[PDB]
Design a protein around this ligand. Structure first.
Ligand SMILES: *[C@@H]1O[C@H](CO)[C@@H](O[C@@H]2O[C@H](CO)[C@@H](O)[C@H](O)[C@H]2NC(C)=O)[C@H](O)[C@H]1NC(C)=O
Ligand SMILES: CC(=O)N[C@@H]1[C@@H](O)[C@H](O)[C@@H](CO)O[C@H]1O
Ligand SMILES: *[C@@H]1O[C@H](CO)[C@@H](O)[C@H](O)[C@H]1NC(C)=O
Ligand SMILES: *[C@@H]1O[C@H](CO)[C@@H](O)[C@H](O)[C@H]1NC(C)=O
Ligand SMILES: *[C@@H]1O[C@H](CO)[C@@H](O)[C@H](O)[C@H]1NC(C)=O
Ligand SMILES: *[C@@H]1O[C@H](CO)[C@@H](O)[C@H](O)[C@H]1NC(C)=O
Ligand SMILES: *[C@@H]1O[C@H](CO)[C@@H](O)[C@H](O)[C@H]1NC(C)=O
Ligand SMILES: [Fe+3]
Ligand SMILES: [Fe+3]
Length: 504
């Protein structure tokens, strides 16, 4: 495959090629397969260091409709027994239980409240080591899970890396999602990054009717942007074969906003997943950091204040200042909204985040950015501030996970498709920062009239990516399209080569 060491490649656009259908609530993989308080939706997450990890799960069925009565989380304990062999779970950790609700005070809308969610942090783990575990409440008969196992990240060091890191976004829960996940699992990743837009529960009215496009269908006829929270539970149940054995790090996208009573947002996202918020001192579910071998990962919030005056930015400055490149040679970031996508969908939508944060990240030698949000695949050439730059990060966007919303197919540079600038900014975060270019081929315009030179590859197909960091300077990136099922199929592949003596 090619290498970034060669400089930028001439842009490639894959010519455009069905329907994407949500899994029904009759699918056996989304049905409740346990009873009483037995654990379901079991998921592992990393802590900030390889020597610790989170185990999470839910006990009890949710409640949808009628007079929901939130469960008392104190009625079911939070216990993980673990050890180095399946028959010797001699260590114990205890954790926290909580519930969340999704409440709408409008006639005809239905309410929701969850089962009891549990989060337990395992401490004192060996890096690179397989741990067996059971979770649940031993004091309740039948309320302990089956034995599962996961492997911690390798120790932090310049020649110590997880073998394969899967990268996906905007999964939703369609049959195309199952293809994405089946492709990914067959590549046996050591770690999964989910770059926002998880269940797409907000494509449903509270009465269970879904659409491919909420604005198109329900915006003018509903008092709020509704959700059907059971889609989250279906998603967690479907994903358990992956999450119970492979650590998954999630960061929020716009579909997690899910505004409800009293302006409350992100309830399901903030409650359902474990994040290394305390350990990375972000103290926020929306952004955080962690090490996986010699890679320092930063997950940033496109949907929390990212301005230079804000708390996330101050945290990010502190987090970057602590990075020691002789210990973690790689610096990799993920967030939901791409900064350099060339599709019409969400074109320049997160520009204010780029203007706020790009220079800081460039000054610290950010190597790679992963995003979702755009329902297509794109890889940029090394770029900084809309300029090809040998020290600029590679920006890769894999928001093509298979949800039921339309694929991004039109490009902003397509004839007649350049959007009106005032229509582009994210309305949730506000501001407008997307001015016409002042230099380069597109100077004086809002869009190019051809594929921008900082776009290396773009293709409107569903899929997932795998990152194989090899050593201090080389990493192999491969993106796999869902419609290819033959052994070894690869849609896009590149060696990302860092040059720290040049750039830092
Ligand atoms: C870091 O990893 C890269 C990729 O595996 C190494 O580059 C390869 O080295 C082998 C043996 O010399 C060659 O056959 C390959 O063609 C190289 N691939 C590329 C893209 O360059 C590199 O040698 C490693 N560097 C160190 C210090 O270990
Ligand atoms: C309880 C509460 O804080 N409600 C706020 C409200 O004051 C504000 O007008 C509206 C728009 O931001 O946001 C919501
Ligand atoms: C849903 O919860 C809201 C807020 O508590 C409440 O106003 C409303 O009556 C509830 N709806 C139903 C059908 O109970
Ligand atoms: C989604 O899955 C369906 C059914 O398997 C398939 O026909 C369709 O081509 C897939 N969509 C894309 C964009 O690959
Ligand atoms: C849900 O409510 C919408 C709008 O009132 C309605 O059009 C739709 O048919 C309802 N779905 C069900 C299953 O009742
Ligand atoms: C990015 O490009 C614009 C226009 O050239 C420039 O005004 C701005 O200062 C640049 N931002 C940087 C270098 O951070
Ligand atoms: C910016 O570029 C667009 C075309 O892409 C053009 O229509 C518009 O007038 C320009 N605005 C300014 C202030 O130059
Ligand atoms: Fe999405
Ligand atoms: Fe999105």
């Amino acid at each position: 495959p090619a290498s970034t060491l060669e400089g930028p490649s001439r842009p490639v656009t894959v010519p455009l090629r069905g329907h994407a259908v949500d899994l029904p609530d009759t699918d056996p993989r989304v049905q409740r397969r346990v009873t009483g308080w037995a654990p379901e939706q079991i998921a592992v997450a990393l802590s900030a260091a390889p020597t610790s990890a989170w185990v999470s799960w839910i006990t009890g069925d949710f409640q949808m409709g009628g007079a929901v009565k939130p469960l008392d989380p104190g009625t079911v304990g939070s216990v993980v027994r673990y050890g180095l062999a399946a028959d010797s779970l001699v260590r114990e950790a205890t954790g926290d239980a909580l519930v969340y609700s999704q409440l709408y005070p409008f006639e005809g809308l239905q309410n929701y409240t969850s089962g009891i969610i549990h989060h337990v942090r395992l401490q004192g783990l060996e890096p690179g080591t397989k741990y067996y575990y059971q979770c649940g409440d031993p004091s309740i008969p039948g309320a302990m899970s089956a034995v599962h196992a996961f492997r911690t990240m390798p120790a932090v060091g310049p020649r110590s890396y997880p073998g394969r890191i899967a990268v996906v976004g905007d999964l939703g829960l369609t049959y195309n999602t199952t293809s994405t996940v089946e492709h990914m699992a067959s590549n046996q990743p050591d770690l999964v990054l989910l770059l926002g837009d998880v269940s797409y529960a907000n494509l449903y009215l509270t009465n269970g009717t879904g659409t491919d496009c909420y604005s198109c269908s329900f915006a003018k006829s509903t008092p709020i942007h509704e959700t059907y929270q059971p889609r989250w539970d279906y998603w967690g149940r479907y994903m358990e074969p992956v999450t119970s054995s492979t650590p998954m790090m999630v960061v929020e996208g716009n579909h997690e906003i899910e505004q409800q009573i009293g302006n409350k947002t992100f309830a399901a996202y903030s409650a359902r997943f474990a994040f290394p918020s305390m350990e990375s001192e972000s103290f926020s579910p929306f952004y955080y950091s962690f090490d996986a071998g010699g890679i320092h990962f930063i997950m940033l919030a496109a949907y929390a204040d990212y301005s230079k005056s804000g708390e996330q930015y101050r945290w990010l400055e502190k987090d970057l200042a602590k990075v020691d490149r002789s210990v973690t040679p790689w610096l990799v970031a993920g967030w939901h909204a791409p900064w350099y996508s060339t599709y019409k969908a969400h074109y320049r939508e997160a520009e204010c985040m780029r203007v706020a944060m790009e220079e800081l990240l460039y000054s610290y030698g950010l190597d790679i950015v992963f995003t979702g949000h755009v329902h297509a695949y794109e890889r940029s050439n090394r770029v900084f501030n809309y300029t090809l730059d040998p020290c600029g990060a590679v920006h890769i966007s894999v928001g093509d996970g298979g949800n039921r919303e339309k694929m991004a197919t039109t490009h902003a540079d397509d004839p007649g498709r350049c959007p009106e600038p005032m229509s582009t900014p994210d309305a949730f975060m506000g501001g407008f920062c997307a001015f016409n270019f002042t230099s380069g081929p597109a100077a004086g315009s809002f869009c190019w009239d051809r594929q921008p030179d900082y776009s290396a590859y773009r293709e409107s197909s569903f899929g997932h990516g795998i990152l194989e960091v090899k050593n201090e300077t080389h990493a192999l990136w491969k993106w796999h399209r869902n419609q290819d099922l033959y052994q070894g199929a690869v849609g896009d592949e590149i060696y990302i080569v860092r040059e720290p003596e040049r750039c830092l």
